[PDB]
Design an enzyme around this catalytic site. Structure first.
Site, short mmCIF file in Angstrom:
data_model
loop_
_atom_site.label_atom_id
_atom_site.label_comp_id
_atom_site.label_asym_id
_atom_site.label_seq_id
_atom_site.Cartn_x
_atom_site.Cartn_y
_atom_site.Cartn_z
N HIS A 191 0.80 -1.23 0.00
CA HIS A 191 0.00 0.00 0.00
C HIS A 191 0.84 1.28 0.00
CE1 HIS A 191 -4.18 -1.64 1.07
NE2 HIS A 191 -3.54 -2.39 0.20
N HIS B 185 -0.89 -12.70 -2.25
CA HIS B 185 -1.99 -13.50 -1.73
C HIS B 185 -1.61 -14.95 -1.43
CE1 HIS B 185 -5.17 -10.27 -3.13
NE2 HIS B 185 -4.34 -9.82 -2.20
C1 HEM Z 1 -5.84 -6.62 -7.70
C2 HEM Z 1 -4.98 -6.29 -6.81
C3 HEM Z 1 -5.33 -6.55 -5.40
C4 HEM Z 1 -6.55 -6.65 -4.79
C5 HEM Z 1 -7.92 -6.32 -5.32
C6 HEM Z 1 -6.27 -6.98 -3.41
C7 HEM Z 1 -7.25 -7.16 -2.45
C8 HEM Z 1 -6.99 -7.50 -1.11
C9 HEM Z 1 -7.97 -7.48 -0.10
C10 HEM Z 1 -9.38 -7.04 -0.32
C11 HEM Z 1 -7.36 -7.84 1.06
C12 HEM Z 1 -8.00 -7.90 2.43
C13 HEM Z 1 -7.69 -6.72 3.37
C14 HEM Z 1 -8.24 -7.06 4.72
O1 HEM Z 1 -9.51 -7.21 4.84
O2 HEM Z 1 -7.54 -7.17 5.78
C15 HEM Z 1 -5.98 -8.10 0.73
C16 HEM Z 1 -5.05 -8.62 1.56
C17 HEM Z 1 -3.72 -8.82 1.23
N1 HEM Z 1 -3.12 -8.45 0.08
FE1 HEM Z 1 -4.02 -7.84 -1.52
N2 HEM Z 1 -4.95 -7.21 -3.27
C18 HEM Z 1 -4.33 -6.98 -4.40
C19 HEM Z 1 -2.99 -6.99 -4.69
C20 HEM Z 1 -1.98 -7.30 -3.82
C21 HEM Z 1 -0.57 -7.19 -4.07
C22 HEM Z 1 0.07 -6.60 -5.34
C23 HEM Z 1 0.03 -7.54 -2.89
C24 HEM Z 1 1.46 -7.71 -2.57
C25 HEM Z 1 2.39 -7.94 -3.48
C26 HEM Z 1 -0.98 -7.89 -1.91
C27 HEM Z 1 -0.83 -8.51 -0.70
C28 HEM Z 1 -1.85 -8.81 0.22
C29 HEM Z 1 -1.57 -9.26 1.57
C30 HEM Z 1 -0.30 -9.84 2.13
C31 HEM Z 1 -2.77 -9.32 2.19
C32 HEM Z 1 -3.10 -9.90 3.52
C33 HEM Z 1 -3.18 -8.94 4.72
C34 HEM Z 1 -3.12 -9.61 6.06
O3 HEM Z 1 -2.69 -10.80 6.22
O4 HEM Z 1 -3.48 -8.90 7.06
N3 HEM Z 1 -2.20 -7.71 -2.52
N4 HEM Z 1 -5.80 -7.93 -0.59
C1 LIG Z 2 -3.81 -6.10 -0.63
N1 LIG Z 2 -4.29 -4.94 -0.74
#
Ligand code: HEM
Ligand SMILES: [C-]#N
Ligand code: HEM
Ligand SMILES: [C-]#N
Ligand SMILES: [Cl-]
Ligand SMILES: [Cl-]
Ligand code: NA
Ligand code: NA
EC number: 1.11.1.21
Lengths: 713, 713
Positions: free
Chosen positions: A77, A244
């Site tokens: 972010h 993810h």
């Molecule tokens: C289309 C692009 C993306 C979408 C729509 C997206 C969407 C999301 C959403 C909705 C969450 C949940 C947030 C929560 O409720 O706590 C999340 C979590 C996460 N995203 Fe993404 N994401 C995207 C791209 C990425 C990218 C590029 C990365 C890293 C390279 C990333 C890494 C993660 C991580 C590690 C979490 C988990 C957070 C946790 O464990 O607390 N995401 N993502």
């Molecule tokens: C993952 N935003």
């Protein structure tokens, strides 16, 4: 308290050029962050970050006992605000701790992550910036969980107030498209410079376009927004699937339980927000996005289980406990672990945007090759993670510490190393004389060096005169650069360079990059001489020439000036008044209002205008460096009217006789209209100002020439 | 373009502390206006201003061939924004050329006046500021027309952007009272800090209160607003009748003919506004206020005709050509000359507010004494004109040039000359040791010197420690100053002073003013020692003690702090949050955000709070100079919640145990909440910051102690 912006909501706003003063900075005038970071014990910081990953605090308990996923999200972010259109956003300034980013809905509960970092920040103090620490934490997260990263560079100095960025015109957080301030028009065309589908999101809607859970149409949004953040298909697949691989989302109950974002929360919240009334408000009961998805069977360890799941099951639409759309694999065993209860397991789940990686035909090809070859996935992801988190850091010369990758990447717009002795003061004087003897005019000299130097932008620290990329595709063909006049100047300069270098002993030679700038300097000196003043324009050699093969032409396109008020240039007709675009350019060039004012009045009379336009050339001695622009602009004996043929062009006529004296644009006349700019113009148009005008012109000319020179930092 | 102010319209605004940065200033860091003005040939300027008076320009032709009236109005308006409540407004910064003042309705066509002055400004350049030039021009106008002025001081440096001033909450120019943002409540009570009856007027409505032409009720408004601009009855009558001895008003046709104010006008208007469609738009056809009044038979010459007319006729209500209410003389002949046509004459006329000078019983007595004794009128008007135009210039030490009046005036809060040798470094060390031997505590020493020095405000440059006015009425009695504890400290310091002075040879002595400040310095040094640091606090001797007779007690009342976050003090309950009042006080003291932050954290732990309140005293070693306020504020082990009894008081408890650790106010906790202040706090609360905190503290302590020291400037 009624303000000037209330009374006059369309006046030009100059306060963007005066952010980041010494007044707001708590560090002393001489604090140098690079110096401080270079003595940081980076290994000790990384050990403390490692320990932190598994040290749960009760006020925000760690999912699965491990904060790694939360921190990856945080760093993503921090970096993921970046737009290639203007270079604004990105991780390079640590803007996530200020308004508005600290309170964007997509940054919900990243306030907790940043607070978990205060003990480490506190311990190492000024030797590690928050901006650097955000990214380093992401890296150590990935490392702690078994992922090899590509490297890390420090050097992001902290900033002390919000940047002024145009994030869109919507007045409603997360407003769906098609409202009165829609960022979309035509066939789902997103307005430049924006790179996100709704106000307060990083890229796209995880439920799908405007909430419609269609993985195929979601993929269109993903591709568009990621391209606007400088990532292609391969990098986008790697980044999304890579991310993810870890952690989980948070949607344990209805979103209406979640309270005020940080900038709106009570004082007692002590800079935290989104307090939740749902059960405990945290941990197993956390709500952040309102989705409840856990992707892999080992959310705290690197794996290739994201693609194993994606392709290995068939998916069915469902809803989270907060009511959001998401996907479950119904015919699957409960193989996914619970974040807090060792005796629960869950079925695999996915977001609509995860399924895009399988159901978009182009993405499917890549995802399948990553599925079958997880070693290629790991390499792509490591490269793209590095690119993501370093994209706005500037030239590699700014990269600090023991982990910088040695491999030079095409995205970095790389500059070859200089391997030979540099020209000295005497050599510079001899080159200036040769340049002036060749017949090149003050106008050609000054235009050329302006065109080469003024591509720099401070937002992402891309651009500038180093590399001599002005002689290469696409810069040589940009309309603003006057391709045929440019090609003639360059041919003459190249001949002088060849002769000078041919006559050298002992390895000494000069780059075309340096000579372009030195030639510009000689034109400024000659213009001063024409006005009857002997001055020396400073010059610092050391630039090197990059090849066409070291120059990604598509990436270079976002640096083309479509508006440059300093050359009275507008490529087409825009919604935004030209004077607004002038201040935006000044901000990108890192200029204050006074520096913008002096610089433009001198460029006018030096013949810097594209096409030799007479607009704003308020002097009878063109190519002499005088304060004529200001004296004539401010003369009340001249009356100005918009032309019948073009309301953005103005005629200046003698008030008594009616005779036509000058013409100008809005960019020219704003200096005689806006009450702050006219006060500046008045200083430089006074009778006692010729020396000041010249000295301040040369100082800002030199500043522009050196914008990319972090090798002399 | 959605901004932070849009999303969070109630967050605290720190940009007011960072106006006037070097970024916006076109002059170099070392430009010294005093030195430049000192070399100006003031006599030559005044000759050019005399010539200008009767050099009519066609674009704004001179009434009666003489611009004198227009320029007196211009200078009057330049000075007449001043409010005693905060010292804001006035002539001292030349803010009339900036937004919003340049476009207030009451400054209509003063844009023309200022433009008539560009040639002069241009010719003398940086050696005469616009701020000084506006007032000088007023003075020359008076002189040209036969009135001997009291004098003139230069030294008003130009500023380069608008000041942040609260001018009221109305969103409509000139809105009548009782609207949703009414500046009036109850029995026509004007809200502090305001000193005008409608948004965009200088003092009062010339037609009468809310447009009701009642001279008697108008007088009430005049008295109240003029008192709020530091003028008594005598001075108010002299100023109004003095001014309206000259020139005329402009109301030749309907106001609807008049167009956009300068900040709204098209770019071709080149900084000017209020273009009129009525006939020629100027001269005989000019429309400014909408009234059409000419007061005397010789509008270009000083006379005694204002009072002759006022008292010599009976007045009848009538309307101007624009429809405004004004007064014409019953049965009079046409004795007043036309401004443009030698063959027209006019009957005497008056405004409602002119008739107040006769129909208010108190004013009548003064007006009649002036009528009978015109020499008394002339002298009171000259004195009051000097006061009006110099009221915000600060101590006499700032006054430059050859025309400064030698007479010392009570309004100046005068400081006696120093006539004897000053204490040196040896003597300062000996006094500090005696101060620390007497028993006075760190808390007492620091509180007392803060209370003496922190009365200064940069808005009008009144206040500060020079003069030792803290020992006099009314400062000694102010609640914030803790009158009983104050009296005890002063008794001990006066005994030390008496003994020191008694033992000197050769006329050396120390002022109580100096000793109060030196004593505070010793307490800071002692605090540092208690924290185990060797520190030396700078001190510059040279203050003198003013007498009670040199100290106008009513004038001094507007300097009482009713809010002082730096002592955790709030006198009552205000509409404005206490953190807002904090930043306002910082602005008056000239502090940046970082200096406000450091200064308040240190004062907390030194025992500077009023009443020895524990609020914000986040240390276990009170009276030791440390960064404990910051380290403890930022400790996430502590949870904060508002108290049941008072929502503006907070309890800090151990998050685990529940045990009570601290209490704080909103002033305390804002530093742990506001995202920019928390960033500053973090710097000072880091592990490597103890020495920086001490050194930055001592620098801002010293700054505050020296705020009024223009004798050293
Ligand atoms: C289309 C692009 C993306 C979408 C729509 C997206 C969407 C999301 C959403 C909705 C969450 C949940 C947030 C929560 O409720 O706590 C999340 C979590 C996460 N995203 Fe993404 N994401 C995207 C791209 C990425 C990218 C590029 C990365 C890293 C390279 C990333 C890494 C993660 C991580 C590690 C979490 C988990 C957070 C946790 O464990 O607390 N995401 N993502
Ligand atoms: C993952 N935003
Ligand atoms: C109760 C306070 C006052 C009111 C309500 C008032 C009102 C007015 C108005 C309405 C005008 C007409 C402006 C125009 O249409 O051009 C005017 C003109 C003028 N006032 Fe005042 N005034 C006040 C106090 C003063 C003071 C304190 C001075 C100077 C000491 C002053 C000096 C003048 C002069 C010289 C003009 C003539 C301008 C010209 O010839 O263009 N007035 N006044
Ligand atoms: C008089 N204004
Ligand atoms: Cl930014
Ligand atoms: Cl002000
Ligand atoms: Na950026
Ligand atoms: Na003031």
């Amino acid at each position: 308290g009624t303000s000037n912006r209330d009374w006059w909501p369309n006046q030009l706003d100059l306060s963007i050029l005066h952010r980041h003063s010494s007044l707001s900075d708590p560090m002393g005038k001489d604090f140098n962050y690079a110096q401080a970071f270079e003595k940081l014990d980076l290994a000790a910081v990384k050990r403390d970050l490692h320990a932190l990953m598994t040290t749960s605090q009760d006020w925000w308990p760690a999912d699965f006992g491990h904060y790694g996923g939360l921190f990856i999200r945080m760093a993503w972010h921090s970096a993921g605000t970046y737009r290639t259109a203007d270079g604004r956003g990105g991780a390079g300034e640590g803007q996530q701790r200020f308004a508005p980013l600290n309170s964007w809905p997509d940054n919900a509960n990243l306030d907790k992550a940043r607070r978990l970092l205060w003990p480490i920040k506190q311990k190492y103090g000024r030797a590690i910036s928050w901006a650097d620490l955000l990214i380093l934490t992401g890296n150590v997260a990935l490392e702690s969980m078994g992922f090899k990263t590509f490297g890390f560079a420090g050097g992001r100095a902290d900033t002390w107030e919000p940047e002024d960025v145009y994030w869109g015109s919507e007045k409603i957080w997360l407003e769906l498209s098609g409202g009165p301030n829609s960022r979309y028009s035509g066939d789902r065309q997103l307005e430049n410079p924006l790179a996100a589908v709704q106000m307060g999101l990083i890229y796209v809607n995880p439920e799908g376009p405007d909430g419609n859970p269609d993985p195929v149409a979601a993929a269109r949004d993903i591709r568009d927004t990621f391209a606007r953040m400088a990532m292609n298909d391969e990098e986008t697949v790697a980044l999304i699937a890579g991310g993810h691989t870890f952690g989980k989302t948070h949607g344990a109950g209805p979103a209406s339980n979640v309270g005020a974002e940080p900038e709106a929360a009570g004082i007692e919240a002590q800079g935290l927000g989104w307090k939740s009334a749902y059960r405990t408000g945290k941990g197993a009961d956390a709500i952040t996005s309102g989705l409840e998805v856990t992707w892999t069977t080992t959310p705290t360890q690197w794996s290739h289980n994201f693609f194993e799941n994606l392709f290995g099951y068939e998916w069915e639409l469902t809803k989270s406990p907060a009511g959001a759309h998401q996907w479950v694999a119904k015919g699957a065993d409960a193989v996914i672990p619970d974040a807090f209860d060792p005796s629960k397991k869950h079925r695999p789940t996915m977001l609509t945007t995860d399924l895009s990686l399988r159901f978009d035909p182009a993405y499917e090809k890549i995802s399948r090759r990553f599925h079958e070859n997880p070693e290629q996935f790991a390499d792509a992801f490591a490269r793209a993670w590095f690119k993501l988190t370093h994209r706005d850091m500037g030239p590699r010369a700014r990269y600090l510490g023991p982990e910088v990758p040695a491999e030079v990447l095409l995205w970095q717009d790389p500059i070859p190393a200089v391997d030979h002795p540099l020209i000295d003061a005497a050599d510079a004087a001899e080159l200036k004389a040769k340049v002036l003897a060749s017949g090149l005019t003050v106008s050609q000299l000054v235009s050329t060096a302006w065109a080469a130097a003024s591509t720099f932008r401070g937002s992402d620290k891309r651009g500038g005169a180093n590399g001599a990329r002005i002689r290469l595709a696409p810069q040589k063909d940009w309309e603003a650069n006057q391709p045929e006049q440019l090609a003639a100047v360059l041919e003459t300069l190249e001949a002088i360079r060849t002769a000078f270098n041919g006559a050298q002993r002992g390895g000494k030679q000069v780059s075309l990059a340096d000579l372009i700038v030195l030639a510009g300097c000689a034109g400024v000196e000659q213009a001063a001489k024409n006005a009857g003043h002997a001055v020396t324009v400073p010059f610092a050699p050391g630039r090197a020439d990059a090849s066409q093969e070291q120059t990604d032409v598509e990436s270079m396109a976002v640096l083309e000036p479509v508006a440059d008020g300093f050359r009275n240039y507008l490529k087409g007709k825009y919604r935004v008044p030209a004077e607004v675009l002038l201040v935006d350019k000044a901000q990108l060039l890192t200029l204050s209002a006074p520096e913008m004012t002096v610089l433009l009045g001198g460029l006018r009379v030096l013949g810097a205008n594209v096409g030799q336009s007479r607009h704003g050339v308020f002097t009878a001695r063109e190519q002499a460096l005088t304060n004529d622009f200001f004296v004539n602009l401010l003369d009340m004996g001249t009356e100005w009217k918009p032309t019948a043929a073009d309301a953005d062009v103005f005629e200046g006529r003698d008030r008594a006789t009616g005779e036509l004296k000058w013409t100008g644009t809005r960019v020219d006349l704003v200096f005689g209209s806006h009450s702050q700019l006219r006060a500046l113009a008045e200083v430089y148009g006074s009778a006692d100002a010729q020396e000041k005008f010249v000295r301040d012109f040369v100082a800002v000319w030199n500043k522009v020439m050196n914008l990319d020179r972090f090798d002399l930092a």
